Amino acid sequence: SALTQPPSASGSPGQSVTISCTGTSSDVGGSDSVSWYQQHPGKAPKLIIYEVSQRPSGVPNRFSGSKSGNTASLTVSGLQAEDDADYYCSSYGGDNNLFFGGGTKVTVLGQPKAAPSVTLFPPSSEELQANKATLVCLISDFYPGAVTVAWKADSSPVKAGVETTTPSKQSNNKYAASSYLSLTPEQWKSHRSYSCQVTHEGSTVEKTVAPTEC
Amino acid sequence: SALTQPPSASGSPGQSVTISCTGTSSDVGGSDSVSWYQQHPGKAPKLIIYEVSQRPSGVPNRFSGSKSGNTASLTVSGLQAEDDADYYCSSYGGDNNLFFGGGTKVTVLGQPKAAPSVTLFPPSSEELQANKATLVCLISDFYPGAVTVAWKADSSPVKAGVETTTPSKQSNNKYAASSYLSLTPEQWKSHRSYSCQVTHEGSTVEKTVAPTEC
Ligand SMILES: C[C@@H]1c2ccc(OC[C@H](C)c3ccccc3)cc2C(=O)N1CCOC(=O)NCc1cccc(-c2c[nH]cn2)c1
């Protein structure tokens, strides 16, 4: 997205959370046209802030919006269970275009936080002899169930061939997901290493694997 | 107040489908500020139409929007699997109001069945060093999105320590899931092999991995 939002935020009932929406001087910074939207997954979204700070009728004053330079911010005070949702920002542009942020998943903690176990697997013997070199990054035992994954070929980001599953709650009531990177045998063998970067609750873990002689 | 959309619509591959969005004279019928969004479950939405009929760059011209009186309509020609999603309409009204429809689930009927690709990964060296031996059975590219998984230690059923993620649709419009088996290094080294057996629509794919010899 052209506007940048943090992937996730969280707080316990009664706490406050602030989420940011960063653009450039030609969008967020160029006018007072920032809006915020709330969506409970699967249901219609709702406009909750317009013109940076204005609440539509029925939106409680626990929601407030502000802007400083090229960054707008939404604050939710006294978190309530109904505030657990996805939040998006938008801003008009210079060419009367419209820019959206990528969305922030806001969790009202329903259980203790849990950092993910991250395990990165290199290509298996069987798939290599089948001319495939898929890497798997296993992410388990985390809460809230929101994670963002990035891959790097050596030091360069790689977006092609990346797939990540939607987190699902497992039998221990914590979430699991897997990110897999479909490489050719040539790609795998011709790089010094590949890395899986897992971000959860604003904290990042990195794992790396490299080809071996056996 | 919400705008009125049918809860569901459908069509076959290559066919067309039209879905409607009915508002009032002071929103949909009041100006040319009608928008349409496409959203796959668990993902951020994508604006596909603005100002009744305009497509953002990169949106296929198979999507077309029109408006008559109080009712806007989206038409998707040449339906593709990727078009199976929720579709929302929106319209600005007076008083800086932004109205949203309740959403239409568009189903693309009779999508092709696809058996899963299964790749079984043995424990990585890093985790065997940290006294862990998780195995991951990666299951991808299958449709419809339901599988069952069974594990074997040698030829015997594994009855504990298994987790399987809820399948999720990926960028190829087919489903992916992971099943992971938590073992200790001692369990991994004692047995001759471990096997993952994936059942999809009555057919079973089995993979086997054994302690390496490197
Ligand atoms: C990922 C991001 C995104 C996030 C949120 C979201 O809706 C949130 C709403 C509340 C919503 C709707 C439906 C369900 C839930 C939430 C849409 C998008 C989008 O599409 N995204 C991808 C980046 O592309 C853009 O920013 N394009 C915006 C665009 C492009 C070109 C022209 C115009 C234009 C001109 N003039 C008026 N409009 C606009």
Side-chain angles (χ1 to χ4, degrees), chain A residues 152-170:
Chain A
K152 278 157 74 106
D154 285 335
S155 312
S156 303
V158 49
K159 286 102 117 299
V162 169
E163 301 280 354
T164 303
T165 62
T166 305
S168 54
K169 196 178 75 180
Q170 301 305 136

Side-chain angles (χ1 to χ4, degrees), chain B residues 113-137:
Chain B
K113 201 181 105 196
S117 303
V118 181
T119 318
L120 182 53
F121 297 79
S124 53
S125 280
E126 169 172 343
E127 83 167 326
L128 282 162
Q129 291 278 105
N131 198 48
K132 298 204 179 301
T134 315
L135 293 27
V136 60
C137 186

Side-chain angles (χ1 to χ4, degrees), chain A residues 37 39 42-47 50-51 56-57 88 92 96 98 100-103 117-127 132 134-136 138-141 162-166 168-172 175-178 180 207-209 214, chain B residues 37 39 41-45 47 50-51 86 88 92 95-98 100-103 117 119-124 126-127 132 134-136 138-141 162-166 168-172 175-178 180 207-209 213-214:
Chain A
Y37 318 81
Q39 185 187 30
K43 305 289 285 203
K46 172 181 185 173
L47 176 76
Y50 63 92
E51 290 176 340
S57 215
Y88 299 90
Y92 281 135
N96 222 118
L98 188 57
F100 285 98
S117 171
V118 184
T119 313
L120 179 56
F121 297 76
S124 75
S125 190
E126 183 179 350
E127 68 165 343
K132 288 187 186 189
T134 303
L135 313 172
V136 175
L138 178 64
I139 318 168
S140 57
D141 304 306
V162 169
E163 301 280 354
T164 303
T165 62
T166 305
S168 54
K169 196 178 75 180
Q170 301 305 136
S171 75
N172 67 348
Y175 287 85
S178 52
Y180 52 107
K207 297 282 181 168
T208 298
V209 291
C214 192
Chain B
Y37 303 84
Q39 187 175 38
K43 304 260 172 290
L47 176 94
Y50 63 97
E51 294 174 26
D86 293 322
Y88 295 96
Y92 292 96
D95 183 23
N96 304 284
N97 293 326
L98 180 60
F100 285 101
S117 303
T119 318
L120 182 53
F121 297 79
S124 53
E126 169 172 343
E127 83 167 326
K132 298 204 179 301
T134 315
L135 293 27
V136 60
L138 178 68
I139 312 160
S140 64
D141 307 326
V162 172
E163 301 290 341
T164 304
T165 66
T166 298
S168 62
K169 188 179 288 194
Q170 305 301 140
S171 78
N172 61 9
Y175 289 84
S178 287
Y180 53 105
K207 301 294 196 193
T208 306
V209 293
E213 317 132 77
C214 299

Side-chain angles (χ1 to χ4, degrees), chain A residues 122 188 191-194 208-212:
Chain A
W188 166 239
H191 290 84
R192 302 168 199 100
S193 67
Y194 279 80
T208 298
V209 291
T212 60

Side-chain angles (χ1 to χ4, degrees), chain A residues 36 49 52-53 55 60-66 73-77:
Chain A
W36 293 87
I49 296 287
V52 179
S53 59
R55 285 180 295 277
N61 62 20
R62 305 186 287 99
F63 296 88
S64 66
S66 61
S73 291
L74 182 75
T75 301
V76 184
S77 305

Side-chain angles (χ1 to χ4, degrees), chain B residues 4-205:
Chain B
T4 298
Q5 297 180 254
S8 70
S10 65
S12 284
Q15 283 184 352
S16 300
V17 66
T18 300
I19 55 169
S20 63
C21 171
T22 303
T24 75
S25 62
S26 60
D27 41 72
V28 171
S31 65
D32 284 334
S33 66
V34 172
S35 301
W36 289 90
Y37 303 84
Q38 180 195 69
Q39 187 175 38
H40 298 273
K43 304 260 172 290
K46 183 188 190 192
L47 176 94
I48 55 168
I49 296 284
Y50 63 97
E51 294 174 26
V52 163
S53 62
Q54 303 300 287
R55 288 180 290 275
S57 297
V59 171
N61 57 28
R62 307 187 292 105
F63 296 90
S64 63
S66 66
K67 185 169 83 110
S68 178
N70 290 339
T71 292
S73 306
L74 176 73
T75 301
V76 186
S77 66
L79 277 166
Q80 301 294 91
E82 56 266 28
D83 305 334
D84 193 307
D86 293 322
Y87 292 83
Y88 295 96
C89 62
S90 76
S91 176
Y92 292 96
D95 183 23
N96 304 284
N97 293 326
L98 180 60
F99 300 87
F100 285 101
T104 302
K105 164 64 159 77
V106 174
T107 291
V108 180
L109 304 162
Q111 292 176 49
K113 201 181 105 196
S117 303
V118 181
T119 318
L120 182 53
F121 297 79
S124 53
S125 280
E126 169 172 343
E127 83 167 326
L128 282 162
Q129 291 278 105
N131 198 48
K132 298 204 179 301
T134 315
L135 293 27
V136 60
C137 186
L138 178 68
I139 312 160
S140 64
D141 307 326
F142 59 101
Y143 189 93
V147 289
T148 59
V149 179
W151 287 81
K152 309 301 208 185
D154 298 339
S155 71
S156 297
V158 173
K159 293 182 286 294
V162 172
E163 301 290 341
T164 304
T165 66
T166 298
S168 62
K169 188 179 288 194
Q170 305 301 140
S171 78
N172 61 9
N173 310 306
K174 298 175 174 65
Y175 289 84
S178 287
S179 183
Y180 53 105
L181 175 54
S182 288
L183 304 176
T184 75
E186 288 69 32
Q187 296 181 297
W188 168 239
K189 287 146 186 172
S190 63
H191 291 78
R192 302 288 319 287
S193 75
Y194 278 81
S195 293
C196 173
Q197 299 176 335
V198 181
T199 303
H200 175 256
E201 299 295 328
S203 295
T204 300
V205 180

